[PDB]
């Protein structure tokens, strides 16, 4: 028994915050962060798969992700941009 969003754990969520310069963290932050992360992932993956489906493929490619991220307005360098 376990859920996958919950696999995004507290230690890890604490680390991202720390890179962002966060010093003290309300205990409610963690479930909020999983919510936000899930919308971010859905929005991007949905677009990526739309690229896959258009390319008549059964495999999400790094370019499908890069193109998705680009039209979401989050351009990524380093993976074939």
């Amino acid at each position: 028994l376990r859920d996958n969003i919950q696999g995004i754990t507290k230690p890890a969520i604490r680390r991202l915050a720390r890179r962002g310069g966060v010093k003290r963290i309300s205990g409610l932050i963690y479930e909020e962060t999983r919510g936000v992360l899930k919308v971010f992932l859905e929005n991007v993956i949905r677009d990526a798969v739309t690229y896959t489906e258009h390319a008549k493929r059964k495999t999400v490619t790094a370019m499908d992700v890069v193109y998705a991220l680009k039209r979401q307005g989050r351009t990524l360098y380093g993976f074939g941009g």
Binding site: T9, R19, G20, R24, V36, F40, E53, L76
Partner: protein, 98 residues
């Protein structure tokens, strides 16, 4: 016996994670999540290793950025603790929830 006062290790960790570039989410839990979510849009999908890697890069950059604006918002309310109302406020002004 010895122990650091609260806030001190927190600052050490900040200096640490701001100095490095490693991914901060464990690879496999994240990979599950990605596949899990993908499966609701098309079934029996496969992923290039790089496709999962780009996604993680994108997410961690996004979230690290979001915590920056969130932390600004907490400080604006004369606090040093981020709270969901801070994240909500940052997302509305970024226009993600407006």
């Amino acid at each position: 016996p010895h122990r650091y006062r609260p806030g001190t290790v927190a600052l050490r960790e900040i200096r640490r994670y701001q100095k490095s570039t490693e991914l901060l989410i464990r690879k496999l839990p994240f990979q599950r999540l990605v596949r899990e979510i993908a499966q609701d849009f098309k079934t029996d999908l496969r992923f290039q290793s790089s496709a999962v890697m780009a996604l993680q890069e994108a997410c961690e950059a996004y979230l690290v950025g979001l915590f920056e604006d969130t932390n600004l918002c907490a400080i604006h309310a004369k606090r040093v603790t981020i709270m969901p109302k801070d994240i909500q406020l940052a997302r509305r002004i970024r226009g993600e929830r407006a």
